[PDB]
Design a protein around this nucleic acid. Structure first.
Ligand SMILES: [K+]
Ligand SMILES: [K+]
Ligand SMILES: [Mg+2]
Ligand SMILES: [Mg+2]
Length: 135
RNA sequence: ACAU
DNA sequence: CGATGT
């Protein structure tokens, strides 16, 4: 119903899918960019969306912040809930890096705790998520 | 179908 | 138009 403005919004950007993947997190209220991942040469949209949320979790925990995270990805929200990214992406030499990051993100979730609410950004009502890349 |  | 996902 109401946007929770005191929150962190994340999103993925890619050139191709699968393709070059990056992600960022912003202050929902102001749009300030709080983190940005160096582009990863081959990944999927959903792996990027998943890593973005987990990074948000790590970022907010490190800073003792109880803010919620918004993501527009139904898929990534569920993967985080499950602590398991069910990506179809082939594992080979050119996807090794993204798969290393995904594996490590799952491992972080399985070894840490958090109370952060992970909320669905309601694109149909509110427009584009504030972390969107605009591609 | 929905979410990207 | 193509792909990633539940
Ligand atoms: K975009
Ligand atoms: K589809
Ligand atoms: Mg998105
Ligand atoms: Mg976007």
């Amino acid at each position: 119903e109401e946007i929770i403005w005191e929150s962190l919004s994340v999103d993925v950007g890619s050139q191709g899918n699968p393709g070059i993947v990056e992600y960022k997190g912003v202050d929902t209220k102001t749009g300030e960019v709080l983190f940005e991942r160096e582009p990863i040469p081959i990944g999927t949209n959903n792996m990027g969306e998943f890593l973005a949320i987990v990074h948000g979790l790590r970022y907010l925990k490190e800073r003792n912040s109880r803010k919620p995270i918004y993501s527009d990805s139904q898929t990534a929200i569920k993967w985080v809930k499950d602590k398991k990214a069910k990506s179809t992406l082939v594992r080979n030499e050119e996807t090794a890096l993204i798969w290393k990051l995904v594996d490590e993100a799952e491992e972080w979730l399985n070894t840490h705790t958090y109370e952060t609410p992970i909320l669905k950004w309601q694109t149909d009502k509110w427009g584009e998520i504030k972390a969107d890349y605009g591609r």
